[PDB]
Design a protein around this nucleic acid. Sequence first.
RNA 1: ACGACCAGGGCUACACACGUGCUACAAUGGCGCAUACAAAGAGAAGCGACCUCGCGAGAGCAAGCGGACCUCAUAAAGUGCGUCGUAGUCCGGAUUGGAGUCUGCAACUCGACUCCAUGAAGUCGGAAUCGCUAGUAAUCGUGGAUCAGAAUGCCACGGUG
RNA 2: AUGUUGAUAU
RNA 3: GCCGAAGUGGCGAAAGGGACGCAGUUGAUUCAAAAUCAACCGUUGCCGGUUCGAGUCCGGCCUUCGGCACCA
RNA 4: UCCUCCUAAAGAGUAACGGAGGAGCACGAAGGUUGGCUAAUCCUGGUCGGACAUCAGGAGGUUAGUGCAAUGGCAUAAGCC
Lengths: 177, 115, 7, 84, 60
Amino acid sequence: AKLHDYYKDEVVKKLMTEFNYNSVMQVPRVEKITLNMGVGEAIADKKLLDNAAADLAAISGQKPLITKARKSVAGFKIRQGYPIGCKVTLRGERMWEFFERLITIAVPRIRDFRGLSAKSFDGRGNYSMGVREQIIFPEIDYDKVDRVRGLDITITTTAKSDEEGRALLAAFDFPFR
Amino acid sequence: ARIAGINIPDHKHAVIALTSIYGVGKTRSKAILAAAGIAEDVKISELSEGQIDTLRDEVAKFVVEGDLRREISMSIKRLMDLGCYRGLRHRRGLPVRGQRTKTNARTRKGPRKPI
Amino acid sequence: XXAXXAG
Amino acid sequence: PRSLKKGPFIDLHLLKKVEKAVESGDKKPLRTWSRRSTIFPNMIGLTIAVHNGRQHVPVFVTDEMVGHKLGEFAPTRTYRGHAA
Amino acid sequence: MKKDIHPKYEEITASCSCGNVMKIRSTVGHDLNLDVCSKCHPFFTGKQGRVDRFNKRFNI
RNA sequence: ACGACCAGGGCUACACACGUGCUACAAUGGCGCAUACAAAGAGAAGCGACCUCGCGAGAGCAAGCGGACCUCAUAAAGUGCGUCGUAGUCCGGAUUGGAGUCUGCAACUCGACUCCAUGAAGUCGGAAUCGCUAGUAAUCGUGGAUCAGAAUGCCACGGUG
RNA sequence: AUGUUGAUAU
RNA sequence: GCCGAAGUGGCGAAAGGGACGCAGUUGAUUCAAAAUCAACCGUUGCCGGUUCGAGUCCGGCCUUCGGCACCA
RNA sequence: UCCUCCUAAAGAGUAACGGAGGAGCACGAAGGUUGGCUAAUCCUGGUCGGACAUCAGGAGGUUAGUGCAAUGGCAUAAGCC
Ligand SMILES: [K+]
Ligand SMILES: [Mg+2]
Ligand SMILES: [Mg+2]
Ligand SMILES: [Mg+2]
Ligand SMILES: [Mg+2]
Ligand SMILES: [Mg+2]
Ligand SMILES: [Mg+2]
Ligand SMILES: [Mg+2]
Ligand SMILES: [Mg+2]
Ligand SMILES: [Mg+2]
Ligand SMILES: [Mg+2]
Ligand SMILES: [Mg+2]
Ligand SMILES: [Mg+2]
Ligand SMILES: [Mg+2]
Ligand SMILES: [Mg+2]
Ligand SMILES: [Mg+2]
Ligand SMILES: [Mg+2]
Ligand SMILES: [Mg+2]
Ligand SMILES: [Mg+2]
Ligand SMILES: [Zn+2]
């Protein structure tokens, strides 16, 4: 809610002024934040997937969805419908709380943080970033890590351009290099 | 127990625990602790939160971890881009400090690859 | 043999 | 490395040739044998053709080369792999 | 939210070394004690020459 | 010119194979603090104390000594106490980065040493193979020749045994 | 038990 | 002209998600060579399919081998 | 023997030692119904992650899918949960 309140009170006014929008509905909102773990090694052992899910659950606060292979792929030795990943979709209050926890805590705790890339937009105002270790989230205990395990965050936006996209995140002081 | 963006060991004496920081050896580890005013035999587990914070301030006086790693990486990249002798040695993966390559030099050359 | 000795 | 109290080393023949070269302008390269001479700031810009044993290798002196010896930019041994 | 599938997710304090107290919701269970936060981290705060070297060491 | 002089390079190269060594893989050990007991030897373009400065390699100043006198020069293993607790580690110290010192017209190719950082392989070694019968083997330091500088080699010396 | 061979001239 | 086998390491020859001999290479043993010992190295004729995936299944092609070519 | 296409001359049927392929099953769900859902492929961004895994968005519009050949069907899906 902190950053949701900050969005409504402060960010909307910045983006209105910046882009000279007619309507307030023309301002970029943050739609959702999808955390994904590709757990391709789980073909060997399903316990790793369970542990991966448990980590993503701790980070997010939601029980994750176990994703599965859209098709068989011989390169990675996966058949169709084999569980090879897991995701959480964060929307609303939980999204904003996570987005706080990411910016204020987790991103600082990245090893050798020199800003996030500003060229990591899809072309349609959505931002994606790799987390390389689950240690950056304090929710994970450092002691009980079986394997070091990253996840990809994606912040989906109602921004049309990347300029609108980056401006929105920049208004939250999203740490861009 | 978390200093310089790493989790240092808790059960170890502080002198040893600090050396887990990249850029901190035995001599610095002693200077850090002596500046912070912590006895070397103290286990990091036994320290209070304020004592950890003083150590973080003391460690911050030294170029460590990613600051150091990029200093080193730059210093090597500098040489390789110059095309100085040491540069060429770094590129080819051969001893840089004038050691013999007729024999030994396996640390640089890696395991032997037969003809 | 050896195509033609004592070493 | 050479003591700081002694200062840098350069051949007096090299020094004067460089001093003259800077005074005139960036001319045809300075053909030296003085591989042992330190590269000075005033050499920056000059091409110094340094002996490697058999030929004078052109070295265009940049900022990053300052402090190095001229010999560092003229390799003496030829090697292109075994069985190549 | 569904009932009794999710992690227990409740407000906890997170006091940084710099002194930034927070009140995040989290799964962790207890109050955190952070080493670094957004308000004090080098990048966020913004607290991150051979010819010069030559002139210093020798000074002719 | 197959003679002679010179500068720079090379003898230090490196897919690789072998010989001889050094250092290890640790707890009969590592580290810290304290404290015992040698022999033999060298020294004037030399050995260099004390004192002062430097974390240190060293630097400055300057006695003494051609030596049973002065100097190199604290022997180390040991012993006492503490710590580590079997870990690729407080084992190992390769490699590399940065910063230096000294010798020398000159340390790039290609010196030794110091400081900070780095912290590789290695957990006792396949077939095979070597030395040694006693103050020996094993292990521990010490000195010397060559030498401006440059030993893990060589030649020698005692300690434990 | 078994257990081969040793280039030419000198 | 027809019809069955096949084509795999250097050689011979085994096997819908590449081993065995010999050879070769390195080391050892020997005064030396062999024998021997210890390591190691190589890896699916061709083309197009089927398939998530082909040495492996399908079709065609090339090369080799075998058999059949009779009644007149 | 059986199935699909073509020969087959725009109804049906139609021969050859004509041209091409398949079957001799599977499934207690892969059947019934209710409710829901929509494909291939490529592009852009994204930890490990690569041409191709999982994630996000875009383009695209069934070029997918159909327990197994081919043909005719299939979005109100007959396709997916
Ligand atoms: K014979
Ligand atoms: Mg060190
Ligand atoms: Mg050398
Ligand atoms: Mg000469
Ligand atoms: Mg030699
Ligand atoms: Mg040690
Ligand atoms: Mg001497
Ligand atoms: Mg004497
Ligand atoms: Mg190992
Ligand atoms: Mg051990
Ligand atoms: Mg005897
Ligand atoms: Mg000795
Ligand atoms: Mg001498
Ligand atoms: Mg005979
Ligand atoms: Mg008809
Ligand atoms: Mg008709
Ligand atoms: Mg009829
Ligand atoms: Mg329905
Ligand atoms: Mg149905
Ligand atoms: Zn803070």
